[PDB]
């Protein structure tokens, strides 16, 4: 549920709550969210889990990025609120499992689930943008000059997001799960089990870069740039179908500006990761740079921006 190990349930929840979570906080019915999640669990492979019904829809008290920044800076009328932003999984604990499961780990897991849901929504939006961008393939290739840049930017952003997501999923969260399993297998007492789980959680927190509100802001900026490009492409597709804000104002110039902003945010995140790798032996930033610069399209850009 929280880590979306069962992909069928996560896909079903995304499909059912695409129009429900995307609605505002008071415009998205929490009962409707729960019903859509239940339908996702029933109509997905997660029904194979005996405790698949134990999961529920949860609403965060604040934005995930805002919470990450506030926690890092430790010692909602002006920010848009949406059910998609607040969508997450919740779990109840019953003693002595309630005496074992606490709310600090629960808060970390809920933050991870909300971040994963936002990333999945961004990837789905990029795929939808590229799918509607395929109309130029069936159309004349010489009447897509403005859309060529938009399609190229959508493909580049989707590929970068996919590579980053694959690297993160296989190196940050997966190491935490493996550490949890191995150390709990080596745990004999309550203290040993707590130490195992805490080692896994601390490895996850350290590898997820949950200490820089500037990094959270940069990731939010990149996601917003991708969303604006997708919105502009969707508006163009809707206008073309009928013919047959800032992003929607211009077709290619706005797409270029959004791509530039997203690339700047990604480069800032890469530089911060490289600095962390240089200071803390932390190979996660090097792996992220390699993943984004596999073909050297952005390897040269990152190297030049380092200077």
């Amino acid at each position: 549920y929280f880590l979306m190990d069962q992909g069928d349930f996560f896909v079903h929840f995304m499909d059912l709550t695409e129009e429900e979570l995307k609605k505002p906080v008071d415009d998205i019915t929490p009962t409707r969210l729960e019903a859509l999640l239940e339908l996702a669990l029933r109509m997905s492979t997660a029904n194979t889990d005996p405790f698949k019904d134990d999961l529920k829809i949860d609403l965060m008290p604040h934005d995930l990025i805002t919470q990450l920044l506030r926690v890092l800076a430790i010692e909602p009328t002006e920010l848009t609120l949406s059910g998609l932003e607040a969508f997450s999984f919740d779990y109840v604990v019953t003693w002595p499992l309630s005496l074992i499961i606490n709310r600090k780990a629960l808060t970390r897991y809920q933050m991870l689930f909300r971040h994963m849901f936002y990333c999945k929504h961004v990837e789905r939006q990029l795929c939808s943008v590229w799918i509607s961008n395929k109309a130029a393939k069936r159309f004349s290739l010489h009447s897509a000059k403005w859309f060529a840049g938009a399609f190229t930017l959508r493909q580049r952003m989707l590929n970068f997001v996919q590579n980053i997501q694959s690297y993160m999923m296989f190196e940050v969260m997966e190491p935490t799960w493996h550490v949890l399993e191995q150390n709990l297998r080596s745990a004999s007492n309550i203290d040993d089990v707590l130490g195992h789980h805490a080692s896994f959680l601390d490895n996850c927190l350290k590898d997820c870069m949950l200490t820089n509100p500037e990094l959270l802001r940069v990731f939010s900026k990149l996601m917003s740039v991708c969303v604006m490009f997708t919105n502009c492409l969707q508006r163009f597709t809707q206008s073309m179908k009928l013919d047959s804000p800032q992003l929607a104002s211009s077709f290619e110039a706005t797409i270029t500006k959004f791509d530039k902003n997203f690339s700047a945010h990604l480069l800032d995140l890469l530089a911060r990761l490289s600095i962390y790798s240089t200071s803390d032996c932390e190979h996660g930033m090097a792996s992220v740079i390699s993943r984004l610069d596999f073909n050297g399209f952005y390897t040269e850009r990152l190297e030049r921006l380092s200077a």
Partner: protein, 444 residues
Amino acid sequence: MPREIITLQLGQCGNQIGFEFWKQLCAEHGISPEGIVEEFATEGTDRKDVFFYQADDEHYIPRAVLLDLEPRVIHSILNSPYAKLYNPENIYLSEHGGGAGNNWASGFSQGEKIHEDIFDIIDREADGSDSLEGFVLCHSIAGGTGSGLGSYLLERLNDRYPKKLVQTYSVFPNQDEMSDVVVQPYNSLLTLKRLTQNADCVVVLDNTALNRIATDRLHIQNPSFSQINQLVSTIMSASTTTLRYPGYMNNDLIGLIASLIPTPRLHFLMTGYTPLTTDQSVASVRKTTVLDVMRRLLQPKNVMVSTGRDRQTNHCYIAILNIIQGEVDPTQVHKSLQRIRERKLANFIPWGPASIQVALSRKSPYLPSAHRVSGLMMANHTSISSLFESSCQQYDKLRKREAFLEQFRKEDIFKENFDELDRSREVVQELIDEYHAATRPDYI
């Protein structure tokens, strides 16, 4: 939520491929030939609804419609062990067994004439699928029924489901062998045009390449159609392994389409499988390191597509997706990726986003795998344009000499003029030019 795929079989070769795919799905899902679910496959955690629709006895019945213009393949499928596996209401057999006569125009006319029944079956499948993602059209570009009727069915599906992903299993004609159908080049051009204009993605399955792979790797002298059907079934199971096994990323066909097709025009992704060895060749527990798996996928001898190695144009892959089935260490996959990036084993598109994906998935528990780790490569590369150019050359050889043009002219599509064949040649040439630009820095 299931991401349903409606398997459409067209022509004799298409019907054989569809029957093989249904048998492979039943075998992987522990479904008996009559459809009955095996006792060992009842408690699976795989998304069985995603890939197959169970029958009223919890019996995996593939949502496949077999359409053929001849009764021989239909009778063979209905007499096959998987006859009861498929639902009877989804199988349509044309009473007129005269076929298309190896003519794409005749096949298109037959598909248009049977559009009502085909459309009814497609609509029944769509209303019967809760979250249907799309339909897969398996047809042959060399035959008449497979080509024309495949194009007709694909156009009907594209019009009826614009929100559904469109994947086509197009059998390309043998570029090295003189096709027994003289109108084969025109039919291949028409099939290519239909795939380029109305299909979101077309996967080329070359029968000549399959025979070459069987002979060179399996030491199969003159492989039979049964061998080709079994290979197609194995390939379909490998392609649907990620859909069957709930993983961490790319759990839906929409995601697979997005990751496999960076260019809407150049959305054709070629397939490679490994290991490709005969059962007689017992390679002693050959430990496939992730680097070795990547090398095998990139190996031309493991590619099931005959793409011309033109030295004038430096072809490169627009995107690469590697699916490893079995117990694969993600650390091993990451080390292989790092070593491959260091060694430049594959040239990426210079005007395409950096796309190299590695997905970890588990193999089917009911299907015996001799290799603990298996690897399949799905990549969108400009090298397929060499095959498109070869098909265009064959079509031009038929069109310029008006060879086998009597069959096309006898149909309404080419009675007045050869605009259909000319459009087919133009679409193939346009795809080839777009692929050549994709190999060039000016693709973006």
